[PDB]
Structure 1
Amino acid sequence: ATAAEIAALPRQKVELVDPPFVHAHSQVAEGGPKVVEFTMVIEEKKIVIDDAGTEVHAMAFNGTVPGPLMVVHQDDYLELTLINPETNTLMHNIDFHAATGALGGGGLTEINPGEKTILRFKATKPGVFVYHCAPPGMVPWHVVSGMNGAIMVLPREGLHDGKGKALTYDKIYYVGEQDFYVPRDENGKYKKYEAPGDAYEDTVKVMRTLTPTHVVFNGAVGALTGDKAMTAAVGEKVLIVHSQANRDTRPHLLGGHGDYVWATGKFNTPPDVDQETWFIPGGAAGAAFYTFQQPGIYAYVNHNLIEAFELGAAAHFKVTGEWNDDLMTSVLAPSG
C-alpha cells in the first residue's frame, strides 16, 4: 500500500518472555495490520550446559538460548531494535527466515559492540520461522553458540486444519533445540576458555566432525525436565513450536502424538496428521498441535534416542487429569 498508509499503521511495542513461554498475543488478529515492535539486547556470556559444569560462551539474543519467540500476524510488520552492548566483544546481526531481502536482514543489521540497529520487514508468509545471527565468514560459529530463535507469523484468521476447521490452542510452548560442539582435551575433559574467540579454532575442529557433543532444549541438558517440565491438563489443546537452526531433528511426544503437524512450519502447507514422530530439517522451525487425553508424565524428545538420552535432547510434560482406561489399561500388572 501507499507510503502514507504504511506510516499511518499503528505501532505497538511488545514485552518479550523467555522460552519456553511466549509473550502475549491473540491467535486471530485484532484490528488491521500493525508494526509490532520488539527490542532485544545481545548477551555474550558463559553458561553451563550439563551436570558436569561444561561451559559454552553463549551468544544470546535477549540473554537466552534459544532467543525468544516473537509472534505477529501475516502482513503485520516486525520492527526489531537490536542492541549489541559495548561489553560484548563480537560483531553480530540477525537473519529472519520469515523476511524477504538482504540475507533475511543480516546485511542491514551488522552491529559492533556499542551499536544498535532497527530493522523492519513485512511478515508476508504465515508460519513459524527460524531467525539467527549470521556474520559473514563466521555464520555457523555464532549459530552453534546459541544465537538463534524463531518467530511465528500467524494467519490473520488463526490456525486451521486441512479441511478449514479452526484449530485454537489453549497454550503454546517454544522448544528451541541446540547442537553444541564443545572442545575436549586429550583426557576427554571439556575445555574452558577465558574469552569467546579463544575457543574458535578448537570449536571449528569439533564442528567439522558434524557430531555435536551435546544436543539440548532451552540451552542445557534437563532444562525442560523435573520442576521445569512443561504442563497441560487432559482436554487441553497445546501448540509446540520447535526449531533447529543448524541441524535436523525429529520430535516425538512419548505417550502422545502430533494431531496436526505443520512439519515444514508453514501454515499454507496443510498439516500432516496423527503423527508419531515428525521431522524438522536444520535451518527450520515446525509446529505440532495436540489435545492431551491422558494424565501423567510425558517425555518430548528428538527421536534419535542417543541424541535424546545420551546427548540431552529430552524434555517432559506433566499432565493433570483423569486416566482413560478405554484408551489404555494394564489388564495384568507386571507379575511373576
Structure 2
Amino acid sequence: DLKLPRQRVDLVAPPFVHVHEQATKQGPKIMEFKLVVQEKKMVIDEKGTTFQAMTFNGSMPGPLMVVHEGDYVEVTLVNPATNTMPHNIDFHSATGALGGGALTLINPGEQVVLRWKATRTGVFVYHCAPGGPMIPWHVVSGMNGAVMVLPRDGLNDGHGHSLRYDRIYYIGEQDLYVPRDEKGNFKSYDSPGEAYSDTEEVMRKLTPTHVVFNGKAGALTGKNALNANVGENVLIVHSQANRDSRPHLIGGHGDYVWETGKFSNAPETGLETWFIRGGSAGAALYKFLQPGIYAYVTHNLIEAANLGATAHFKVEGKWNDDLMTQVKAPADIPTGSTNENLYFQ
C-alpha cells in the first residue's frame, strides 16, 4: 500500500559517503539499502594486533546512509551462514520496536527487511543489539554506523541562511577492549565466541585498550589522510555508539557544530572542541582557511596519541600570513635577554 518511487542506494566504505543531493525537490521515496553482517578477524593497530570483529558491510564503522526528511528507509539486513551468531539492527533515527531491533533478529543463513520512516532530521547512530550482554559486546566488536537524515532544503545555520558542504567525511570512532596476557601482550583468538569471556572482563572495567577511527590506529593518517582544499566547506560527521568523545580539528575550528547531531537545533559557532555523547552522532562544518596537515582527534590526547584516535587532513592551497606567521624562526636566546628577572623565577 505504500505507493512511492523506490531508489536503490549503493553504499561505500567510510570515511567516504555515497553520493546524494543536499537540497532536493524530489518528493519522499523508499530508499533501499542492504547491510550484510560480516564477522572476521581485523587488524586494529600499527603493531599488527588482531581483533575478532563483527561488522556491517565489512567495515568499522558501518557505512553512512544518507536520506531526506520524510523518506522511507527500507533496509535488507543479511546474516550469511558463514557467521556464527544472531544479529539485528537498531536505528536511533527510527520510531518503535527498539529502533527496529525487535523486528530484525536473524540467525546465520537468514535475512530480514525493515522499513522505517525518516521523521527526525540529523545524524544518528545505528548498531546491532541482540539482547542483554550481547548488546554492548556486538557494538564494541564493531557493529555500529550512522545514518544522516537531511532536511529537504539541506542544512541551514539556524538563523535562516543555507549552508552547503563541498565535501563530507564520516568518522566513526570505536572503543575496543582487547584482553592481555599475564605479560601484558594482547591476546589473539580463533573466533568471537572464544574471545568473549576475556573481552567481557576488560569491558567491565570501562577502560578501552584502543580508541580508533575507521577501525584501526593510523587508518586515516599516511596515504589515507583526508583531502581538502583551502576554501572548501567540509562536513565531518562523527559517531560513537558506546562511549563519549571530544572531537577537535588541530589548527582549525568547528564553524558550525551540531554536537547533539540534530538539525532541528541551531548549530553552535566557532567551537574549539565539541562533545559526542556515547550513543550518538554529531556533525561539524568547517571552511578551511590554511593549507597543510591538520590532525583530527578526540582531545583526550592520551587516547588520540597513545590509543589510536588521530586522523589527518592534507589541505592544498596558499598560506595566509595574515592569519598566522612565523615572525622569527627558532634562534639562540639572545645573550642580552633578561629572563631571570621574570615574576615566576
Q: Same fold (TM over 0.5)?
A: yes
Q: Select the residue among 37, 42, 58 that pairs with 1:42.
A: 37
* Alignment partner, residue 264 of structure 1: 260
Q: Secondary structure at the match of 2:77?
A: strand
* Alignment partner, residue 166 of structure 2: 170
* Alignment partner, residue 95 of structure 1: 90
Aligned residues: 331
Q: Secondary structure at the match of 2:196?
A: helix
Aligned residue identity for 2:190: E
Per-residue CA deviation, residues 217-266 of structure 1 (Å, 9 max, x unaligned), is 00000000011000100000100000000000000000000000000000
Please list every run of 5 or more consecutive structure 1 residues that lacks an aligned counterpart in the other structure. Answer: none
After superposing on structure 2, the runs of 4+ consecutive aligned residues of structure 1 that deviate more than 4 Å are none
State the Cα distance separating 1:30 from its structure 2 match: 3.9
Q: Secondary structure at the match of 1:8?
A: coil
Q: Secondary structure at the match of 1:83?
A: strand
Q: Select the residue among 25, 28, 34 that pairs with 2:23.
A: 28
* Alignment partner, residue 17 of structure 1: 12
Q: Compute the RMSD of aligned alpha carbons.
A: 0.6
* Alignment partner, residue 276 of structure 1: 272
TM-score w.r.t. structure 1 length?
A: 0.98
1:79 aligns with 2:71: no
* Alignment partner, residue 140 of structure 1: 136
* Alignment partner, residue 61 of structure 1: 56
In the TM superposition, 1:1-336 aligns within 5 A as: 4=1, 7-137=2-132, 138-336=134-332
Q: Secondary structure at the match of 1:24?
A: coil
Q: Secondary structure at the match of 1:242?
A: strand
* Alignment partners' CA distance in 2, 1:136 and 1:162: 38
* Alignment partners' CA distance in 2, 1:334 and 1:293: 25
Q: Which moved more, 1:21-30 or 1:116-125?
A: 21-30
Aligned residue identity for 2:216: A
Q: Secondary structure at the match of 1:162?
A: coil
State the Cα distance separating 1:162 from its structure 2 match: 2.1
Aligned residue identity for 1:272: E
* Alignment partners' CA distance in 1, 2:172 and 2:179: 22
Per-residue CA deviation, residues 78-135 of structure 1 (Å, 9 max, x unaligned), is 1100100000000000000000000000000000000000000001000000000001
* Alignment partners' CA distance in 2, 1:248 and 1:117: 31
Per-residue CA deviation, residues 172-220 of structure 1 (Å, 9 max, x unaligned), is 0000000000000001011111111011110010001110000000000
Look at both structures and tell me which one has the larger radius of gyration over its CA atoms: 2
Per-residue CA deviation, residues 138-161 of structure 1 (Å, 9 max, x unaligned), is 100000001000000000110000
State the Cα distance separating 1:29 from its structure 2 match: 2.1
Aligned residue identity for 1:288: A
* Alignment partners' CA distance in 1, 2:191 and 2:44: 17
Aligned residue identity for 1:188: G
Q: Secondary structure at the match of 2:193?
A: helix
Per-residue CA deviation, residues 254-295 of structure 1 (Å, 9 max, x unaligned), is 000000000000000110110000001000000000000000
* Alignment partners' CA distance in 1, 2:245 and 2:16: 21
* Alignment partners' CA distance in 1, 2:52 and 2:113: 26
* Alignment partners' CA distance in 1, 2:293 and 2:26: 39
Aligned residue identity for 1:323: W
* Alignment partners' CA distance in 1, 2:223 and 2:25: 35
* Alignment partners' CA distance in 1, 2:200 and 2:254: 36
TM-score w.r.t. structure 2 length?
A: 0.95
* Alignment partners' CA distance in 2, 1:52 and 1:157: 46
* Alignment partner, residue 335 of structure 2: none
* Alignment partners' CA distance in 1, 2:276 and 2:46: 28
